[PDB]
Amino acid sequence: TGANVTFKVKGTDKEFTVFTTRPDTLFGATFTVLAPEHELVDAITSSEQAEAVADYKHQASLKSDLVRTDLAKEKTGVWTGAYAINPVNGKEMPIWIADYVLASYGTGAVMAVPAHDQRDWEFAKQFDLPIVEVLEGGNVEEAAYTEDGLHVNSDFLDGLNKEDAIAKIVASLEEKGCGQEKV
Numbered sequence: 001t002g003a004n005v006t007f008k009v010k011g012t013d014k015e016f017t018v019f020t021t022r023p024d025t026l027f028g029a030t031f032t033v034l035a036p037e038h039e040l041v042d043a044i045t046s047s048e049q050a051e052a053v054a055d056y057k058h059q060a061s062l063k064s065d066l067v068r069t070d071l072a073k074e075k076t077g078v079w080t081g082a083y084a085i086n087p088v089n090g091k092e093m094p095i096w097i098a099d100y101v102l103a104s105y106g107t108g109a110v111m112a113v114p115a116h117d118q119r120d121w122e123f124a125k126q127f128d129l130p131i132v133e134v135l136e137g138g139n140v141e142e143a144a145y146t147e148d149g150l151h152v153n154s155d156f157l158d159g160l161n162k163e164d165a166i167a168k169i170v171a172s173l174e175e176k177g178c179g180q181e182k183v
């Protein structure tokens with residue numbers, strides 16, 4: 001079981017939805033990543049980034065799913081030039097494309113939580129993106145912390161465990177109309 005979370009694209013009437021197994025880490029989402037093949041990419045890419053996005057989409061189409069999701073391969077990607085809006089606090093999150101996100105799985109878009117997801121962490125370290133701890137237990141600048149722990153830096157989720165935080169965040173999202181549990 002997981003959840004869908006919907007993000008508005010800043011400065012537009014566009015939105016996209018991600019699939020996440022950990023809606024409770026929403027306050028640690030410091031960027032979002034679309035599959036290079038995602039349907040929204042071309043419409044939100046800025047003119048300055050357009051050529052780099054086109055070049056990267058071509059590169060990504062020449063790699064299989066297995067090579068793209070391989071943990072040992074160097075992370076690659078490019079900024080679209082656009083920002084998503086985090087629904088819980090209104091903060092802007094840069095929208096990247098990266099081939100470790102697969103078009104066919106879930107929605108083809110993720111919220112990136114580099115502190116607590118190994119692939120997001122590798123991407124953030126490769127591209128100097130912020131890393132924000134929301135589950136205590138590790139030292140997230142040195143190593144992704146991929147285990148359970150009490151929530152921090154998470155407003156009304158602070159002090160809760162995974163099961164409680166997930167229930168609370170999903171309730172908040174369903175109530176704003178920008179999230180729901182998904183299986």
Ligand SMILES: CC(=O)CSc1ccc([C@@H](O)c2ccc3c(c2)[B@-]2(CC3)O[C@@H]3[C@@H](O2)[C@H](n2cnc4c(N)ncnc42)O[C@H]3CO[P+](O)(O)O)cc1
Nearest residue numbers: 019020021022100101102105106108110111113116117146
């Ligand atoms: C079921 C549980 O609670 C088990 S405790 C657990 C502990 C750590 C992690 C960790 O890693 C993690 C941390 C945070 C986030 C996650 C993960 B996220 C986004 C937020 O949840 C990911 C989601 O990003 C990513 N993802 C979705 N769509 C695609 C796609 N199209 N391409 C490539 N990646 C994609 O992967 C799904 C689930 O993956 P599953 O369905 O294989 O389980 C997790 C659990």
